[PDB]
């Protein structure tokens, strides 16, 4: 259902499958690990990708 989210905090990956981002970036959601962790990549920078905490984003699209 959810396709685009906007990050609301900074986040540094703790593990090598995790996405590092700053606040204000758009993520394209491409998958889910669980209710607290989704998978995606940066809109406009798809090479930046990985697992990220859902609590760190606001739903934007879909």
């Amino acid at each position: 259902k959810v396709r685009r989210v906007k990050t609301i905090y900074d986040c540094q990956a703790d593990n090598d499958d995790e996405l590092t981002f700053i606040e204000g970036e758009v993520i394209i959601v491409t998958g889910e690990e669980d209710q607290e962790w989704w998978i995606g990549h940066i809109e406009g920078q798809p090479e930046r990708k990985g697992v990220f905490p859902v609590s760190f984003v606001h739903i934007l699209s879909d």
């Binding site: 905090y9 986040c11 703790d14 593990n15 669980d34 962790w37 697992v51 905490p53």
Partner: peptide
């Protein structure tokens, strides 16, 4: 603002 644990 705590990051939930990976599991």
């Amino acid at each position: 603002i705590k990051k939930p644990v990976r599991r």
